[PDB]
Amino acid sequence: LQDLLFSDGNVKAFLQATTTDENKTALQQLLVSNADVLGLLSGNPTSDNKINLRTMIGAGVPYSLPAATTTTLGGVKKGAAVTASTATDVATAVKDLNSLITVLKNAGIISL
Amino acid sequence: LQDLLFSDGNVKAFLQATTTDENKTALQQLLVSNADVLGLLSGNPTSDNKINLRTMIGAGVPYSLPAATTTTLGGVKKGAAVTASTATDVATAVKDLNSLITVLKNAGIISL
């Protein structure tokens, strides 16, 4: 009787409660007009759909913290411990300054 | 007449335009074959469905920037201000080096 009453085969499969993946694609298209949402409903959105779906919900991509560069904000590693200076001569004061410089160089806080 | 024409109860509920949550689960299964997409359509995907849905669209999880460790890339906090050195003796030069070391230690740029 459903064959006598309905022409569309995707509708008929829905009414029989047995749909193929192709029937589901067509039925999704009857229910939703946004192309990026249709991409989501397929379970296999295109690259363009993915970008647009994130825009649609205001979502970001997985963020990876980059190392600091001389031009670009980034993360650093924390420098090793450095002892306060008790230098009473120039040679030692210079030794202590250099220890700080190397620590900052080691942590990528300053350039080589 | 629909009772005389169709055997499937979930199809019949669809044709009456009145579906329960159970009818909707069954109708989803007639329309879509991918198990992870069926999880999404339920509104309550399992843990496995969630992982697979993200894979399906190439999405990442919420990213949290970890602190730098000696083995693993991470973020740092920016060090406090440090004055350029005008030291003319060793004691002062060492004092200034140590000030840099403590600043880098305070910001977790180098280890204690």
Residue numbers in the entry:
A (entry chain 7c), B (entry chain 9P): 170 to 281
Sentences from the study reporting this entry:
The bacteriophage ϕ29, a representative of bacteriophages with a short non-contractile tail, has an ~19 kb dsDNA genome encoding ~20 proteins. Here, we report the cryo-electron microscopy (cryo-EM) structural studies of the ϕ29 prohead, the mature and the genome-emptied virions at near-atomic resolutions up to 3.2 Å. Our results show structural details of the complex capsid, the DNA packaging motor and the entire tail machinery, and provide a molecular basis for understanding the assembly, maturation and infection mechanisms of the bacteriophage ϕ29.
We calculated the cryo-electron microscopy (cryoEM) reconstructions of the ϕ29 prohead, the mature head and the genome emptied head to a resolution of 3.6, 3.2, and 3.2 Å, respectively. Our results showed that the 448-amino-acid-long polypeptide chain of the major capsid protein gp8 folds into three structural domains: the small N-terminal helix domain (the gp8-N-helix domain, residues 1–61), the central HK97 fold domain (the gp8-HK97 domain, residues 62–347) and the C-terminal immunoglobulin-like domain (the gp8-C-Ig domain, residues 348–448). Structural comparisons using the HK97 domains showed significantly greater variation in the hexameric capsomeres than that in the pentameric capsomeres (an average r.m.s.d. of 2.2 Å vs. 0.6 Å between the aligned Cα atoms of the corresponding HK97 domains of the mature head capsomeres). With the cryoEM map of the mature head calculated at a resolution of 3.2 Å, we determined the structure of the pseudo-hexagonal base of the head fiber (residues 1–110 of gp8.5). Further analysis showed that the icosahedral end caps of the mature head expanded slightly upon the loading of the genome. In addition, we did not observe any pRNA density in the 3.2 Å mature capsid map.
